[PDB]
Amino acid sequence: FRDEGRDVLLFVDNIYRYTLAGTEVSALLGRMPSAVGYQPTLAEEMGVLQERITSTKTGSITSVQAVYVPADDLTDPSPATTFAHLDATVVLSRQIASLGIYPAVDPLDSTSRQL
Amino acid sequence: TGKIVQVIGAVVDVEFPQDAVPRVYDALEVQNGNERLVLEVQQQLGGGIVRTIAMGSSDGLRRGLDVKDLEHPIEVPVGKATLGRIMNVLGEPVDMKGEIGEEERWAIHRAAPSYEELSNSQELLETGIKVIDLMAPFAKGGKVGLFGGAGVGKTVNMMELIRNIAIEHSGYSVFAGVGERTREGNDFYHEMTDSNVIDKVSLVYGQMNEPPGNRLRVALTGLTMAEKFRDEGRDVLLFVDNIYRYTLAGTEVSALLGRMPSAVGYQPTLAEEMGVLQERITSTKTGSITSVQAVYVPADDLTDPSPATTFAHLDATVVLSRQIASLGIYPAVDPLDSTSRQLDPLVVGQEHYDTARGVQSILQRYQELKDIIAILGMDELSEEDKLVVARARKIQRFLSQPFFVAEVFTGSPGKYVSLKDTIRGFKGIMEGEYDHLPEQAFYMVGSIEEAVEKAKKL
Amino acid sequence: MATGKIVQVIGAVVDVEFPQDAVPRVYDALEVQNGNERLVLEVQQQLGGGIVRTIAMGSSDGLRRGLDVKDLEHPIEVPVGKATLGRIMNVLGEPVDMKGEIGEEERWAIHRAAPSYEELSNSQELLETGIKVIDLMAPFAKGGKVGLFGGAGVGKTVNMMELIRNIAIEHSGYSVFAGVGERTREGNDFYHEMTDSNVIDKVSLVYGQMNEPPGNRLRVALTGLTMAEKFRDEGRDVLLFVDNIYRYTLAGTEVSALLGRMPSAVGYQPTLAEEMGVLQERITSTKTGSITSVQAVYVPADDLTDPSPATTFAHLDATVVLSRQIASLGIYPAVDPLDSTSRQLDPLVVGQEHYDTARGVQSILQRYQELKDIIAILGMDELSEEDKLVVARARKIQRFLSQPFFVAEVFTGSPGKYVSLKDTIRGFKGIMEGEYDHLPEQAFYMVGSIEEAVEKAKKL
Amino acid sequence: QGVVENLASEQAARMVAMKAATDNGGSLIKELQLVYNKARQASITQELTEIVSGAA
Amino acid sequence: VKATGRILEVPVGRGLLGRVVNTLGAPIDGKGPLDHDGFSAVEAIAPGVIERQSVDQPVQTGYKAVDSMIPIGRGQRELIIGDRQ
Amino acid sequence: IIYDDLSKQAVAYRQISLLLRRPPGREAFPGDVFYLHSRLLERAARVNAEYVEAFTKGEVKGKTGSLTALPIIETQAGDVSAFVPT
Amino acid sequence: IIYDDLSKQAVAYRQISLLLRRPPGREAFPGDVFYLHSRLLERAARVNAEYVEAFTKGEVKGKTGSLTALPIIETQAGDVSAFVPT
């Protein structure tokens, strides 16, 4: 659709389980495990996929992605690496959800480079 | 017929002809110099080679030694003959008396009883210990576990339970020393034989000086003897000095058997090994085995896989703790982790149930108040909170009790407390009848009356 | 004639193959003609079949898989003796300075066994530094290890230079500095500062830069150690300075990881304790000569239970702590007397008088540290006359701890002094027992001995 | 005069209580840090063991 | 060892209601053999997206906290999680 | 349907995997633990009447079949961060 | 008998066990560290006169031999709950 010249809306339900589907089969492929049991190729596997989602001069793709946060810890390598790929990051927090405020966006953590 | 090809610590590789390989749990015998050693098969490798565990010292074994294949598993004497004597893992006599005159020998690798063969009984059993039969009472025929770290009183508590639950039990009993101090076994033997109750207690000792093969299978042989006594229609009491050492022997052996390690350092078969050991120890419809087991937790870590996979196998778990012990409150039973399957109002009564739940509620609230007190002190609390602090401290002091078997370490005379007395005392404290007494009055006393008398002399 | 062939190159690890008669011993050294340069390999393991696994003591780039390797029969041998004084050298004993060839008469191997039980000194002795704070609060044992736990901004380099001068002049000994894996800029600056300070004449320097492969940084400490051992055999009492022992430990970890051995504890090498002991057990007093050592210590993540701090502390005999707070007051050397300790400070080791003097000083300063909080919160009107007297004597003691260094001549103009052990003990005994209560506190600042404090007070 | 004296007493009592709270807070810091250090060390050991064992 | 080319199948039917059975379909309650409506495969795949239907009917736990705050519907998947005992 | 302990199923599968010398992952559990639990749990569903009518070869019409699942998990000292509970 | 530091014997044995590629457990110590210390310490005991008489072949009669043993353990920051101390 982008190469036809149209403006496209792309919704991806979980980038996390793309990385996780990589992790399940990585060891069976003969690879040595990485820091937190991930595959050694996590960064490259993320990059090859996520650098295709761009707005070129012929057409534009606008994308919204849902990102799972294991154990509600933003320190994990998967959310950590996907933070570095996004224009705007709305950080939801389980603390604010448990307190009953909806949406559970953390106003201190959420930012955008268009601001 | 066969020959040894490898000797790696406790495990030995043996080669047999392609058509004469022993079965998975058969026993072999080898001549180590002038002495004979028994090996137990564990795995059949390819080409007629089998991995074995040495039931004795492995030093001095040259490769290229010939072995004899016995055509049966390890078999031990059982019954009336093994009733006043100390025995080894292989069923040999350990006391310097003569041979055991048995009519029958059973293989130690047997199958757990079937589902339709089981029996579940709600008939409650009483101990002289206050906290145990208040918080986590256990009935006849159910497994009791004593958790805790190092030097928190598991052995002393078990000795007290032996002394007290032998009062209302008439039949035979089996004691299994599994990887513990030789001195404790010696002292227990002399204590039993000086009270003339040695004619009913049967002893098996493989202690912490023994090689891994002996420690691993000693638990199984003790349980097997208990099976023989059970199936005569009797009710048996089975005491295990330490059930952690069984899994630890498995841990020491499993690496040399070629098994890739699981979480921490444990063998992949930890759950299955514990399940095989602890599921053939039950009360069937033709017998009953009441059992008390001590579970040593490593590094005071209750989240370790070895204790964590034992909590699901027990009817009454009692968790001793080091912090409670450091305060001098013996027995150091933690009442916020110890529970039982029999703590229900339909089986134990409503007054007992309510008293236990009230104790737990008060102590939980006290735990919550501790972190406020730590920073701010006691002054900033609400008056109700101060009341519950006072009553919780008094309850903690009242949980202690001077045992008869602990009279050496302390000097205080021992005490036996009935269930009615202890529920009356805790009910009285909970509703504030004894708010006028000092805390130290409740320390190391028996019934509440004794605490009042102590308060008179302060 | 070269008798070996390279068979593998993986990173900094080189495997070479020899005939079965000529297989090198474990720590032998081999040399290869890589490009136009000569590359030194240190053997680490004898695998089967005549293959030996080695670590390259230099850049591994450009090595082919068929190059001929020459087998030297000795381990790494470095020049030793008086010719090394004033020179900077690498791990292999070659000048990283540009002054020229080292005219040595003797070359020693860096690997050797520690002195035997029958070689140790028949008694235990104290070593004067001439610095009042150290000689009083944390005296060095002759042949003992000392840990410098200070940071930066405080005068670590100044203290090191002062000790080099004093060991050369007041005693008759030399010094060796081992730059174990540290920055090139700061090594250059240290060299020029010692040239300006006129102490370069009396120390020898071995640097292993951070940008060198892990084997170089691991072995540079042993190079400096063997030079110090030669000076010991001359009958001298030597000072060995280690720029950072933590870097030695960490380079050991890196080498172990490169060799592929399983890691222990918090990720350290399986042989951590042994390597530390091999380094430390050689720093002892012999029936003739001695090697005293000052070692800079960094604790990872401020964790005093971390295996590298825990292992290191088992070998330290004394601890010297440098404080920014003490430096801000202008007191130099900026040694905090409350955190610095030595296990020589016992009455039957140092003498009853010296011990009780040290106890008195430490307790008085502690009491002043508490009264300072009280005075800040309430005020000096609350104090009693006894309390006030304690405060005044504590101020005098704090100032009497300061001392002018010879290097401090250029920074202050003060000529610099050397205080004997009995002199400092007498001065602090006098201040504790009430004598000189009539002097002003500024009489004791940078004044050297107490007999010169009274002269300053005479002029003041 | 009674009221003024009681306010002086109040300030004295508050300063004593605050000093006690400060010392107790330092006490908790010096122990939570030990728990933290042991936790960090154990976590690093576990993860490294997983990596090395998973190399197989 | 012979290789019977069939995947693991288990007895299934209405006659299993009230029976205690092991993983392979063998009764262990001791109340006689089963009365099964044929066999079925243990390892099968789930219905697809087009074959689903939404959840709008309740199932009562009988408790108050659960049925009020955290309701369960017919077709739902609820995780009951906590410590031991 | 009640799965009284999914964690014990996971442990049994871990034992099978390690005895088979398959490569281990986080907390020694193999990576296909998620595949195990996912392909198990997604079998619990509600199916539309067209599916029921097609399966029963026309015998049952106008009814939606449904299966509700209640898996149970044991946490060790409340550590939600563990692999299997996550 | 006095053992100056059993914890550093444990360190030496850990080094030996890791150089032989034996998989370690808690705090990277080998699985048999407990056995090392158990068989070392259980050799200290008090023996009855019958054992001495059997051992000395009757040359020593009516006396009990004994071997008291006080080992030393170092613990970091003064906690007893560590693996080797426990």
Ligand SMILES: Nc1ncnc2c1ncn2[C@@H]1O[C@H](COP(=O)(O)OP(=O)(O)OP(=O)(O)O)[C@@H](O)[C@H]1O
């Ligand atoms: N009332 C008491 N109950 C239990 N132990 C007590 C009591 N009073 C004092 N102690 C002391 O507590 C010690 C711990 O006892 P015990 O050996 O049974 O503990 P444990 O948890 O079984 O330890 P281990 O597993 O190391 O043998 C006793 O040896 C004794 O010195």
Ligand SMILES: Nc1ncnc2c1ncn2[C@@H]1O[C@H](COP(=O)(O)OP(=O)(O)O)[C@@H](O)[C@H]1O
């Ligand atoms: N005895 C002294 N007399 C005068 N100034 C001093 C003295 N000791 C330290 N200083 C001052 O403080 C600094 C100490 O830090 P320095 O040794 O330069 O740190 P580094 O060695 O890390 O560069 C000196 O450069 C000097 O400015």
Ligand SMILES: [Mg+2]
């Ligand atoms: Mg005990």
